[PDB]
From a paper:
To investigate the role of pocket B in the catalytic reaction of PECPS, Ala210, located in the vicinity of pocket B, was substituted with a bulkier residue (Glu210), which possesses a protruding side chain that may extend into pocket B. However, the A210E mutant did not lose its catalytic activity and exhibited mostly the same 1-producing activity as that of the wild type in the HPLC experiment. The binding affinity (KD) of the A210 mutant was estimated to be 40.12 ± 4.52 μM with respect to 4-hydroxyphenylpropionyl-CoA, which was slight weaker than that of wild type PECPS (KD = 18.57 ± 1.37 μM). The crystal structure of the A210E mutant enzyme revealed that the A210E substitution eliminated pocket B observed in the wild type PECPS structure by occupying a space corresponding to pocket B with the Glu210 side chain. Other significant conformational changes between the wild type and A210E mutant were not observed in their crystal structures. The docking simulation also showed no critical movement of the side chains, including the apparent rotation of Asn199, even though the substrate and intermediate were located in the active site cavity. These results suggested that the PECPS catalytic reaction is independent of pocket B.
In this work, we demonstrated that PECs in agarwood are biosynthesized from a common precursor featuring a C6–C5–C6 skeleton produced by a diarylpentanoid-producing polyketide synthase, hereafter named 2-(2-phenylethyl)chromone precursor synthase (PECPS). The last remaining candidate gene encodes a PKS (PECPS) sharing high amino acid sequence identity with the other four PKSs, as well as the highest 93% similarity with AsCHS1, and this gene maintains the Cys-His-Asn catalytic triad conserved in all known type III PKSs. The crystal structure of PECPS showed typical homodimeric type III PKS folding. Crystal structure analyses suggested that PECPS utilizes unique one-pot catalytic machinery that includes the release of a diketide-CoA intermediate, which has never been reported in other known type III PKSs.
Author numbering:
A (entry chain A), B (entry chain E): 6 to 394
């Protein structure tokens, strides 16, 4: 047993102290999206392509998606509705006028749950794949919120769908190595760089237009909680990034003049199914857990088939993925903020249903996300007793 | 004084264990650049414009700059030079083929100085404002170097010129909170997004065409050095980030279909002189240093006038900013990699000249970089005795 200076560092593991989410008011029901999509993109003459997009949208099990892009906005920026037209400047002007503001809606509510003054926030981690800004949205959010000008910011542009786990991994080290540090984690995502019209020669990319959506999630992360005034929800025990073998060019995205064009040539679900058991077994090794159904789950629902395959591969109870399947249905794929919507949903569900811990009665939990790499972010979570709340 | 169980954290401050630099082979003498620049862009008829560019290039106090872009490459990518055609795709293809490779050259040399196997690298921090890639250059560098697929990567896209300080600020928390962790810090920068013809620019952008250049820097950061195998060069004592008052939109870089178009509508040299004394007095507060000439200096030289202003303001010896001026004359503004270049030159110079410490004889040192915000990064450095080397 060894001891060191406390000095300017924190003592215990980093905890999630607050969670809130936000979405644009405008939304589209997935049943109505095909007819809306081919109308605003000037493609009502592509009849078979419209019918195929209808069948794609039904298989996604999505029911509602919030989007900043309205029929009005697409009219004033017709280049975004085209499949490939120079529109980065237009997409970026929308990103500048929405992404920081949407994160503010989530941060304000997350700070509200926190209950502590905003001047106590020492760090800010901001993830977005919806627009590269200089200065970034981390600066705009800091100005909109009124945070300290000396805050230590960390702007993460275009990491992909796995940046949700990357944010927690970063926040863990920031909170633990700095005594009194309170880390505002914000993931404000939108389909601004991805949205485009249908293509009779690129039908593979209609699938992405059927899943992505808009939404922001905000967390307060910190070590050494003041239990008189703060209420930990989870503990961030470990967080590891991994490049999967034989995954070259699995998810590729080129930032062109017409935004991001995601390249998906490799079967992601087969790739995850080959490696998820080994990755989760390494994350759970220190816990001693030996049953998959004795932990709570947070999986990034980027592709819906992975949820069914992972459930069948590990023989999971149909209820252990209820919160993941709820966010995918009510919100779709919000890039990196999706896993944090799922964590907030899993938290709210466990409390409202009278479960013994914020992890639905289970002590340990695993958060699993993925994106370009093929990169996987794995976070081991520890729930708190709901009686402490 | 309090004490905490060490567990899986590190005991001491983060140390710079090794550092190296790399540049593209091709370079242009600043006395030859105006004739080259206006010939390859077919602008030799704009005589009044070319004479202004000569007077601008002479004032930069630069003698050469290394650049990936050659006359053969510009002729093979005429979109980069053509005002009537988009060019972001051609620029990113060049970024994919050079930015990770340039970082590999700098990283391999730093690892050779380090002496330890690559498998002991646990974290990677990559900074670039020269190409948003998915997967990013952090993935590319990881594959080219053969680093562990389980490495904890942190890709920093398009943060601007201050990202040299940001990366040190990030590596400090990564190393100090993880015992045995070793962080590879790479900043690979180039002009692939800002380069364009002279008539395609305003006044402010024409000065950027005379200063920007290509180059990569690579450090090894880690706490608790094995003194049997490793040799610390500097210690990262503190690292803060600040937004300056009354600096809204002082530096803006808009990523468009023609590349990165910068904007500098405010007097950046005047902004720095207004706040540099107060910002550095807070960083030096726990050191007890009273005189400005009792420390070593690493100032970002993106605006050469700031060097001469800070020199007269703080009443510095002409010898103090020697290392900063050597890099500016020999390499120009290499975006975030410039300040790290200066840190390596300051080290090599102090060692070769027989100084007592790697800080040119002095104990404490400040590193100061700036970019869009107006953001200021500030690192407090502690030198080591050269007799240990």
């Amino acid at each position: 047993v060894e001891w060191v200076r406390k000095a300017d560092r924190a003592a215990g593991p980093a905890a999630v102290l607050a969670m809130a989410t936000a979405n644009p008011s405008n939304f589209y029901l997935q049943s109505d999206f095909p007819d809306f999509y081919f109308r605003v993109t000037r493609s009502d003459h592509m009849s078979d392509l419209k019918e195929k997009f209808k069948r794609i949208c039904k298989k996604t099990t999505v029911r509602k998606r919030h989007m900043i892009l309205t029929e009005e906005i697409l009219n004033k920026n017709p280049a975004i509705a085209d499949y490939w037209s120079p529109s980065l400047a237009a997409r970026h002007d929308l990103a500048l006028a929405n992404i920081p503001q949407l994160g503010k809606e989530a941060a304000d509510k997350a700070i509200k749950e926190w209950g502590q003054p905003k001047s106590k926030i020492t760090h800010l981690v901001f993830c977005t794949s919806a627009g590269v800004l200089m200065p970034g949205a981390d600066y705009q959010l800091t100005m909109l919120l009124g945070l300290n000008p000396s805050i230590s910011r960390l702007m993460l542009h275009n990491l992909g769908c796995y940046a949700g786990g990357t944010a927690l991994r970063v926040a863990k080290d920031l909170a633990e190595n700095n005594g009194g540090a309170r880390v505002l984690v914000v993931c404000s995502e939108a389909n601004l760089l991805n949205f485009r019209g249908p293509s009779e020669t690129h039908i593979d990319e209609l699938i992405t237009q059927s899943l992505f959506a808009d939404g922001a999630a905000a967390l307060i992360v910190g070590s050494d909680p003041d239990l008189q005034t703060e209420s930990p929800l989870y503990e961030l025990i470990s967080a590891s990034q991994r490049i999967l073998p034989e995954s070259e060019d699995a998810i590729v995205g080129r930032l062109t003049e017409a935004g991001l064009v995601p390249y998906l040539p490799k079967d992601i679900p087969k790739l995850v199914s080959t490696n998820i058991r080994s990755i989760l077994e390494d994350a759970l090794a220190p816990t001693g857990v030996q049953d998959w159904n004795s932990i709570f789950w947070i999986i990034h629902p980027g592709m819906p088939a992975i949820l069914d395959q992972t459930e069948k591969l590990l023989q999971l109870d149909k209820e252990k993925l209820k919160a993941t399947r709820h966010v995918l249905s009510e919100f779709g794929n919000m890039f990196s903020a999706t896993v944090l919507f799922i964590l907030d949903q899993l938290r709210k569900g466990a409390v409202a249903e009278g479960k013994s811990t914020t992890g639905e009665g289970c002590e340990w939990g695993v958060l699993f996300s993925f994106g370009p790499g093929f990169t996987v972010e794995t976070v081991l979570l520890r729930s708190v007793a709901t009686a402490t709340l």
